[PDB]
Amino acid sequence: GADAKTVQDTVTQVIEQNMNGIDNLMYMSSNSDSTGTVQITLTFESGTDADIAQVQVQAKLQLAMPLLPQEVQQQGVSVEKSSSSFLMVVGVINTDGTMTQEDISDYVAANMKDAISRTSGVGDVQLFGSQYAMRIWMNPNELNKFQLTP
Amino acid sequence: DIAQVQVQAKLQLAMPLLPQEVQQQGVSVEKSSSSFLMVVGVINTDGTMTQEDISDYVAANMKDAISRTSGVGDVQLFGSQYAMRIWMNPNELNKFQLTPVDVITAIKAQNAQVAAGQLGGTPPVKGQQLNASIIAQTRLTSTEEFGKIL
Amino acid sequence: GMAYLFVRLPSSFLPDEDQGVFMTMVQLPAGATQERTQKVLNEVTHYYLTKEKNNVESVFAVNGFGFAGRGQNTGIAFVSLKDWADRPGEENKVEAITMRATRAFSQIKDAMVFAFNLPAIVELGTATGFDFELIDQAGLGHEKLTQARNQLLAEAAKHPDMLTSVRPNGLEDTPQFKIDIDQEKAQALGVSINDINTTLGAAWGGSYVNDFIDRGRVKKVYVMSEAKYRMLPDDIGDWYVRAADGQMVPFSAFSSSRWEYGSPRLERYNGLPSMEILGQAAPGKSTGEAMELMEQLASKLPTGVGYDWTGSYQERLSGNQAPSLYAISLIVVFLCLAALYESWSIPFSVMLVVPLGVIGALLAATFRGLTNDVYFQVGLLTTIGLSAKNAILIVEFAK
Amino acid sequence: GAAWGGSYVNDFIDRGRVKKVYVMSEAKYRMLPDDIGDWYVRAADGQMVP
Amino acid sequence: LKVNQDGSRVLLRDVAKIELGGENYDIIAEFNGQPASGLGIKLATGANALDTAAAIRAELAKMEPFFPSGLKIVYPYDTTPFVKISIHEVVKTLVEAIILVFLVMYLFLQNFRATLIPTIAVPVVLLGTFAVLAAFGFSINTLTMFGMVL
Amino acid sequence: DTAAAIRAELAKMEPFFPSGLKIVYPYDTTPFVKISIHEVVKTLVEAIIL
Amino acid sequence: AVFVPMAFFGGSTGAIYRQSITIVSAMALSVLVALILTPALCATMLK
Numbered sequence: 004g005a006d007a008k009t010v011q012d013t014v015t016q017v018i019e020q021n022m023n024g025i026d027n028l029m030y031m032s033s034n035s036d037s038t039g040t041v042q043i044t045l046t047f048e049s050g051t052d053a054d055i056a057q058v059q060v061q062a063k064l065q066l067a068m069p070l071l072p073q074e075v076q077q078q079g080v081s082v083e084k085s086s087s088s089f090l091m092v093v094g095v096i097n098t099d100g101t102m103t104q105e106d107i108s109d110y111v112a113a114n115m116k117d118a119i120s121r122t123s124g125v126g127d128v129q130l131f132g133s134q135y136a137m138r139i140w141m142n143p144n145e146l147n148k149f150q151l152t153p
Numbered sequence: 154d155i156a157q158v159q160v161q162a163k164l165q166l167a168m169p170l171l172p173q174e175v176q177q178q179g180v181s182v183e184k185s186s187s188s189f190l191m192v193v194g195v196i197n198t199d200g201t202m203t204q205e206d207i208s209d210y211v212a213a214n215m216k217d218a219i220s221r222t223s224g225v226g227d228v229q230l231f232g233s234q235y236a237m238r239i240w241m242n243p244n245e246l247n248k249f250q251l252t253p254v255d256v257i258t259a260i261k262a263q264n265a266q267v268a269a270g271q272l273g274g275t276p277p278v279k280g281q282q283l284n285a286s287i288i289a290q291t292r293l294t295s296t297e298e299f300g301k302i303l
Numbered sequence: 304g305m306a307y308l309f310v311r312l313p314s315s316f317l318p319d320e321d322q323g324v325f326m327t328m329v330q331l332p333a334g335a336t337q338e339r340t341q342k343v344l345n346e347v348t349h350y351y352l353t354k355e356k357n358n359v360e361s362v363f364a365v366n367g368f369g370f371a372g373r374g375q376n377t378g379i380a381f382v383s384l385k386d387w388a389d390r391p392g393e394e395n396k397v398e399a400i401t402m403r404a405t406r407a408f409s410q411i412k413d414a415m416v417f418a419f420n421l422p423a424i425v426e427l428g429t430a431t432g433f434d435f436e437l438i439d440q441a442g443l444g445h446e447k448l449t450q451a452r453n454q455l456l457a458e459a460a461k462h463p464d465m466l467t468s469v470r471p472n473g474l475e476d477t478p479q480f481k482i483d484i485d486q487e488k489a490q491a492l493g494v495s496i497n498d499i500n501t502t503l504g505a506a507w508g509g510s511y512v513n514d515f516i517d518r519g520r521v522k523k524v525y526v527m528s529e530a531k532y533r534m535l536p537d538d539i540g541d542w543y544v545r546a547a548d549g550q551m552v553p554f555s556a557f558s559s560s561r562w563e564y565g566s567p568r569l570e571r572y573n574g575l576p577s578m579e580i581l582g583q584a585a586p587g588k589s590t591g592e593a594m595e596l597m598e599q600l601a602s603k604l605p606t607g608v609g610y611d612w613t614g615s616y617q618e619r620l621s622g623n624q625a626p627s628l629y630a631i632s633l634i635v636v637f638l639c640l641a642a643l644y645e646s647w648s649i650p651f652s653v654m655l656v657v658p659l660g661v662i663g664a665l666l667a668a669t670f671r672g673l674t675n676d677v678y679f680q681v682g683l684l685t686t687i688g689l690s691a692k693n694a695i696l697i698v699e700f701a702k
Numbered sequence: 703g704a705a706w707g708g709s710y711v712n713d714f715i716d717r718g719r720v721k722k723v724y725v726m727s728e729a730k731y732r733m734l735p736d737d738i739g740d741w742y743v744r745a746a747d748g749q750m751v752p
Numbered sequence: 753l754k755v756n757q758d759g760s761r762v763l764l765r766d767v768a769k770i771e772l773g774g775e776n777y778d779i780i781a782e783f784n785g786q787p788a789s790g791l792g793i794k795l796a797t798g799a800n801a802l803d804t805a806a807a808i809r810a811e812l813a814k815m816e817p818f819f820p821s822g823l824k825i826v827y828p829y830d831t832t833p834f835v836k837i838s839i840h841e842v843v844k845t846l847v848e849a850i851i852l853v854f855l856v857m858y859l860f861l862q863n864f865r866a867t868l869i870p871t872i873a874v875p876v877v878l879l880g881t882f883a884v885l886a887a888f889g890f891s892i893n894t895l896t897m898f899g900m901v902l
Numbered sequence: 903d904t905a906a907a908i909r910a911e912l913a914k915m916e917p918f919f920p921s922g923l924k925i926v927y928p929y930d931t932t933p934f935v936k937i938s939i940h941e942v943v944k945t946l947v948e949a950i951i952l
Numbered sequence: 953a954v955f956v957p958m959a960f961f962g963g964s965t966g967a968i969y970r971q972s973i974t975i976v977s978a979m980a981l982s983v984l985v986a987l988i989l990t991p992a993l994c995a996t997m998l999k
């Protein structure tokens with residue numbers, strides 16, 4: 004829900020004043036979007052271990068998790084290994100028993116996405132859709148009808 | 154590099170057994186060396202300023218950079234970073250019938266950022282022409298705005 | 304000639320090959336929707352299917368996900384071409400396919416669609432290319448920095464020489480619908496400020512409530528609203544918050560509708576706000592020249608506006624490295640030709656066969672459409688080894 | 703606690719950067735033992751109690 | 753939710769629509785203009801790429817037999833076959849530079865035996881190079897395969 | 903080298919200070935290293951001449 | 953020497969001018985093979 008200004012100093016900035024005391028570092032950058040999505044990049048020296056350049060980062064971040072909302076805390080925070088690009092991209096479609104671009108995205112992320120991402124050193128997986136959820140669309144006229152709020 | 158880490162993941166199995174006064178306060182696992190080396194004094198000669206204004210500018214421009222740079226263990230400020238400080242009068246609290254709990258409540262309400270959604274939302278109606286992000290409450294900025302809390 | 308055939312021969316790092324897999328990205332103007340950009344990704348799907356059956360095996364487009372970032376403005380169609388055997392000529396190979404693609408998306412379209420190559424490499428090392436960045440070193444804001452970045456993009460394309468190609472990254476700068484809630488109006492009628500904020504947040508933007516279990520697995524539960532009660536500014540007043548005195552109160556009471564200009568992508572570099580400046584070295588000049596005639600354009604900017612280079616490079620290859628490499632490569636070659644020889648004279652025979660085999664190496668590279676990249680640089684070092692070989696025989700058998 | 707020793711309330715933004723907001727009291731109402739009785743807590747029945 | 757005076761029960765369905773839909777509608781993919789989802793796997797920053805892509809199929813293969821009717825896998829954007837072309841067109845070029853050398857060795861010396869010594873003197877050296885790069889850290893790289901031809 | 907890069911950040915910060923703000927250097931290790939090379943590699947050369 | 957000092961890599965072009973060595977193993981194994989063996993096989997069997 005949050006806009007670009009909101010995430011820029013309710014999550015982003017807090018992490019940045021707690022992104023210190025780390026071994027090896029060239030620079031830090033950041034992106035803060037109007038979709039309510041932030042992602043920082045800590046680049047390191049060439050030939051450095053990716054296994055330890057992690058860890059420290061997510062233990063420094065984590066000294067700053069309780070300075071944040073909950074809207075964000077219980078939402079997925081994730082420190083991962085990066086490689087600006089994809090390689091294998093596995094499309095998933097239907098031919099016979101026809102179904103929707105919504106039913107398919109759920110079944111991909113409720114059977115195979117959990118397996119793939121853990122398998123043979125995957126950095127991070129990106130869904131091309133979304134996993135299912137018990138979605139509710141509140142009517143504001145029928146809320147005032149019985150005297151009620153969200 | 155590994156004698157760390159384990160320590161701050163063991164500590165962190167004990168963070169939710171603590172207060173909040175402490176949790177949202179700065180917990181920090183770092184590398185030690187009982188001693189300093191470079192100590193960079195910071196003073197004023199012309200446009201004169203105070204031992205308070207200087208400590209803020211040191212920790213709002215250079216302290217964040219230094220500590221992350223070329224493997225610094227931990228930095229210690231010789232002063233403090235600025236903060237919107239409030240000095241409650243107990244005579245003027247009883248004058249309008251009030252406590253420090255009512256002042257605290259007023260700042261965790263008016264001094265706050267909210268995640269309001271957006272027009273032309275995530276699942277819209279097929280045919281909408283615009284999509285903009287809603288703003289609502291913004292975090293306060295200056296001494297004047299904290300003086301006008303209700 | 305050996306010199307002139309080398310200085311004038313321009314420097315690359317690595318060639319952009321046919322990988323059997325390229326792609327093409329989309330981007331719409333200030334505050335477009337999912338319905339707008341889907342029309343564009345649809346028109347793109349035609350060029351590759353109907354007007355390119357022979358070369359494209361399949362497409363895979365996506366609505367609202369650019370490689371800049373995210374949102375309903377963006378898009379991307381991954382491409383998977385047919386096998387290499389069935390694609391015969393240069394026409395039917397990545398370079399030419401993305402060429403007439405870019406023409407067609409700049410012809411019968413009305414937004415920003417491209418197509419591009421797939422280097423290999425990573426994102427960096429375009430060669431004759433750079434990435435500047437512009438920082439807020441003082442206590443300025445977004446509004447003040449915006450103007451400083453406008454002034455560096457201006458002066459760049461205002462005296463080029465030997466021109467250039469400058470542009471920002473993705474700070475398009477669109478409007479934002481602010482809602483001012485008067486606090487005095489709220490408490491008067493008797494509404495909690497908490498209740499008001501989670502009415503505006505859990506309706507328009509959603510709210511993570513709880514976890515449930517669908518079909519064995521645990522997923523999430525979200526709460527929002529039907530689309531038809533949150534698409535315009537006038538629909539805010541249809542939401543009635545409840546007051547402590549058991550009577551309904553609309554938003555129109557305490558709210559204040561008004562538009563405002565902000566940014567949908569706030570970038571920050573190294574603990575401070577920043578904006579990206581993706582420029583490209585001139586077609587005449589190249590990098591070391593272009594970058595140093597960009598630093599004097601950033602020091603001419605106003606106060607509290609510094610700079611720093613993301614993220615280009617850390618000292619290159621035919622740049623300042625190549626020297627140092629060759630340099631030592633000589634001092635050893637000559638030594639070892641003395642550890643088996645003794646003179647001095649014998650090495651200096653071998654130590655100027657170097658330019659014999661080199662003037663030919665350059666001739667073929669400079670002649671055809673190739674360039675001094677990595678593969679060519681080691682084609683050279685191979686030949687000082689093959690010239691030493693041949694010569695050393697002339698010198699070994701004869702001595 | 704929020705008078706004599708301070709209390710971490712919330713975060714605000716001064717001049718671009720995010721810092722902290724603290725709540726305590728003027729120094730002159732917390733320097734001696736006799737100054738404790740000047741603080742009047744409120745009771746549920748809307749009347750002050752020292 | 754409520755029980756309005758007269759014993760009438762207000763339910764969650766009576767005030768709101770309830771469908772089992774995605775938790776994020778912000779993105780929706782098409783594959784040849786068909787409704788679809790998938791998995792865009794990204795590398796793990798120091799991983800063994802092509803072996804990681806071979807094991808992407810490892811999980812995916814055990815998942816195949818338990819799909820509903822219609823669900824079928826497809827492969828757009830994929831790195832795999834470029835590696836298969838860079839070995840099969842280099843180890844082919846390898847063999848072309850032996851057959852070709854064999855002819856130059858015959859045109860100068862009609863001795864069949866003399867055009868045999870050098871034909872075995874380089875396959876063996878080629879192999880020893882594999883064993884040094886195995887005992888140093890490197891791989892069969894695009895670079896270190898062109899180094900076997902040069 | 904860590905102390906050489908303490909000045910690396912500090913040097914980029916110098917030009918954007920307000921009026922009056924100037925850096926000073928008390929307690930500092932750096933020059934002790936510069937004395938232990940320049941008085942040892944000097945002693946080195948004295949033990950050749952001798 | 954034409955090869956391995958040139959194979960003292962500088963940054964993002966690490967395994968690029970570095971991965972000679974690949975080359976050099978081949979040079980020193982062509983030396984080995986030529987100092988051993990090629991001598992042998994020639995003597996072993998020629999005309």
Ligand SMILES: CCNc1cc2oc3c/c(=[NH+]/CC)c(C)cc-3c(-c3ccccc3C(=O)OCC)c2cc1C
Nearest residue numbers: 319419420421422429430431432433470471581583584
């Ligand atoms: C007359 C034919 N016109 C060309 C026009 C071009 O326009 C471009 C515009 C851009 N718009 C701003 C978003 C960006 C980012 C990259 C471009 C590249 C480019 C793309 C991939 C790899 C390297 C380069 C490249 O040229 O890199 C270094 C120069 C480009 C290349 C050629 C031949």
Ligand SMILES: CCNc1cc2oc3c/c(=[NH+]/CC)c(C)cc-3c(-c3ccccc3C(=O)OCC)c2cc1C
Nearest residue numbers: 880881882883884885886887888889890891892973977
């Ligand atoms: C029968 C003669 N025995 C040998 C026995 C060896 O035992 C080793 C044990 C170790 N103990 C665990 C701490 C580690 C780390 C490296 C070793 C290497 C090694 C050392 C430097 C550079 C490369 C290698 C090396 O062989 O690299 C790739 C194979 C090694 C090499 C040879 C010849």
